[PDB]
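User: I'm putting together a small comparison set for a docking exercise, and I want a reference complex before I start. The sequence is below, and the ligand is S-adenosylmethionine. Could you produce the 3D structure with the ligand included, as structure tokens?
Assistant: Of course. I'll restate your input first, then give the structure tokens for the complex.
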Amino acid sequence: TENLYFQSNEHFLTWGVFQEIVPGFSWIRTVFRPSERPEGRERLAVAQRELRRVLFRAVDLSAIKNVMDFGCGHGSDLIILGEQNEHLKLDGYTISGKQAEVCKQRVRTRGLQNRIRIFQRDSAKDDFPGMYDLVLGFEVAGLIPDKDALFSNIDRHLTNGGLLIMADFVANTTFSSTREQWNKLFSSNHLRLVDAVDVSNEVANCLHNPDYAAQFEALCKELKQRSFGSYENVYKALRGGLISYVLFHVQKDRFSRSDELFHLNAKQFEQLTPYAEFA
Ligand SMILES: C[S@@+](CC[C@H](N)C(=O)[O-])C[C@H]1O[C@@H](n2cnc3c(N)ncnc32)[C@H](O)[C@@H]1O
């Protein structure tokens, strides 16, 4: 549903990789009472950076020129890439006008306005502005209903052999896409799944609730405009294997048969690497 992602429709807007449960850590208190306990904010930021370390595991940024972030949040991913790699040109789309304002300000404050452009545009309806070597979607695609249009937009603006990296959910069997649904989206848009890391255990550790029942409910009443009661369902689903949080590494393959992309992608979807076994 809508309680799957860090935010529904360093300022990262994703869950993080917690190798283990941290006693006392509350993502809810950390996000909505951030002044009260500083160590929580820092632990969460480290975990969101660890998510990104794994997401980028195979990417050689020295080799890439152009980057598209199709749901760019507050622009932190574009800013970090731009600051650390002076040759990159980067574009971001967000459907939020407020986020676009923040992104533009943060880009200019970092002196990156000559290399990063931000647009308030819809990645399923508005063509990306250029051709890209690297496309980022970290907790974005699941929020976009018209995934066929999104993946056509990705394909049409990705150079052959270009890379798509995503953080998103897999339904292991209605809302999140199953393996077969993801495979249809990739295979019908010239995309091969190269490698995927399953961080479900570690995202669940991030979501672990340290407040006992009555205390948690009292906290959520003081906070009153979200509904925090449903996040327990996401935690239970990740613990039980009903859904997985997956870090996808995908390559554009313009010259392969679509049925053979599907055949190879299905095999790769059976080879997901748990983060605990990743190195
Ligand atoms: C959970 S936030 C993640 C933001 C960023 N990727 C990050 O990791 O911090 C989801 C982002 O997707 C954007 N988004 C949702 N639907 C979109 C759409 N159709 N087109 C462009 N952006 C979209 C939101 O505006 C928001 O910026």
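The longest strand covers residues 158-171. The chain has one domain: 13-279.
User: Thanks, that's exactly what I needed.
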